[PDB]
Design a protein that fits this description.
Layout (H helix, E strand, L loop, with lengths): L2 E5 L4 E4 L4 E9 L6 E5 L2 E2 L6 E6 L2 E6 L8 E7 L2 E10 L3 E3 L4 E4 L4 E7 L7 E4 L2 E2 L6 E6 L2 E6 L8 E7 L2 E10 L5 E3 L4 E3 L5 E7 L5 E6 L2 E2 L6 E6 L2 E6 L8 E8 L5 E10 L1
Parallel strand pairs: 2-9, 11-18, 20-27
Antiparallel strand pairs: 1-3, 3-7, 4-5, 4-8, 6-7, 8-9, 10-12, 12-16, 13-14, 13-17, 15-16, 17-18, 19-21, 21-25, 22-23, 22-26, 24-25, 26-27
PDB class: structural protein
Keywords: Titin, N2A, structural protein
Assembly: monomeric
Length: 271
C-alpha cells in the first residue's frame, strides 16, 4: 500500500490567541508522495500564521495565535489518504451576566454569573472595592459558574457587586429590604376627669423611631399643653388640663428609615 496510517488528525478546540496543532502520523512508502495541508482551496505554506513540520511519520500543522476568524475546516492530502478536521476557538467572555437581586434582610444572598472558560480565577468587588472571602461572604467557582454568597444580609450589604476576569467585568446591584417598623403596642382610648392630664403611650418594634402626633388632621407640637417623651421603643404624649375641646380622635405616626412608617389611632374622653 502507498501509505500506512497510524493516527489521523483530530478536531482541535483552543482558547483565543493560543496555537492549535493538527498532527497526523502516517508512513509514506514511496518518495514521490507528499502530504499537503489545506484550508479550503489553499495549500498551506509555512508563514507567520502556519508552521508545517515533519518528524518521521509525524506531520504537524500548527496554526499560530488562533482567532475566531480562523475557525473552520483544515484538511490534508497524502497520496490516497485525505482527512479533514475542525478548529474551534473560544474567546473568554461572560456568557450570562450578573443580574440585580432584591432580598429581605436576614436572607442568604446568592449571585452568579457564567464565564465561557471553566475554572478561571476571578475577583469580586463590592462598591468598587475588592471583596475578600471572609466571614459572611463566600466566593466560589464551579466549572463555568462564578458565585457570590452573603449570609444573613443586612441593609449595609446593598450596593454594586462585580465579578472580573482579566479586564472583562460583569456587574449588578444587590438591594436589601429592611424589616418594616410596626407598633408593638398601639395607642388606646383614654378617659380622664376634666383638668387632669392624659398620657397616650405606644411602643414600636425598633429604637429611635421619629414620631409625629395629631389631633384629628392637625400636627401637635411640644408646648405647655402637649409634652412628648421618647425613650428607646416607647413614645408618649401627655395632654395637660384636659377640657371638652381636647376630646376626640388622636393619632401618632412612627417613622424609621429605611423601615417605612406606621400609624396608630385612639380617642380621648372626659368622664
Amino acid at each position: 500500500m502507498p501509505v500506512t496510517l497510524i493516527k489521523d488528525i483530530e478536531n482541535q478546540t483552543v482558547l483565543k490567541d493560543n496555537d492549535a496543532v493538527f498532527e497526523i502520523d502516517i508512513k509514506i512508502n514511496y518518495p514521490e508522495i507528499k502530504l499537503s495541508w489545506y484550508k479550503g482551496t489553499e495549500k498551506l505554506e509555512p508563514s507567520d500564521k502556519f508552521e508545517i513540520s515533519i518528524d518521521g511519520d509525524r506531520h504537524t500543522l500548527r496554526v499560530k495565535n488562533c482567532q475566531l476568524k480562523d475557525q473552520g475546516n483544515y484538511r490534508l492530502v497524502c497520496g490516497p489518504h485525505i482527512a479533514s478536521a475542525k478548529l474551534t476557538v473560544i474567546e473568554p467572555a461572560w456568557e450570562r451576566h450578573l443580574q440585580d437581586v432584591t432580598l429581605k434582610e436576614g436572607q442568604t444572598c446568592t449571585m452568579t454569573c457564567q464565564f465561557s472558560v471553566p475554572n478561571v480565577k476571578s475577583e469580586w468587588f463590592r462598591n468598587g472595592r475588592i471583596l475578600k472571602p471572609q466571614g459572611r461572604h463566600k466566593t466560589e467557582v464551579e466549572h463555568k459558574v462564578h458565585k457570590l454568597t452573603i449570609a444573613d444580609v443586612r441593609a449595609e450589604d446593598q450596593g454594586q457587586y462585580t465579578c472580573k476576569y482579566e479586564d472583562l467585568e460583569t456587574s449588578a446591584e444587590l438591594r436589601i429590604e429592611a424589616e418594616p417598623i410596626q407598633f408593638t403596642k398601639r395607642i388606646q382610648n383614654i378617659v380622664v376627669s376634666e383638668h387632669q392630664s392624659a398620657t397616650f403611650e405606644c411602643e414600636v418594634s425598633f429604637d429611635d423611631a421619629i414620631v409625629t402626633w395629631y389631633k384629628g388632621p392637625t400636627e401637635l407640637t411640644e408646648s405647655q399643653k402637649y409634652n412628648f417623651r421618647n425613650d428607646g421603643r416607647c413614645h408618649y404624649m401627655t395632654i395637660h388640663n384636659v377640657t371638652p375641646d381636647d376630646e376626640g380622635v388622636y393619632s401618632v405616626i412612627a417613622r424609621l428609615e429605611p423601615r417605612g412608617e406606621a400609624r396608630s389611632t385612639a380617642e380621648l374622653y372626659l368622664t
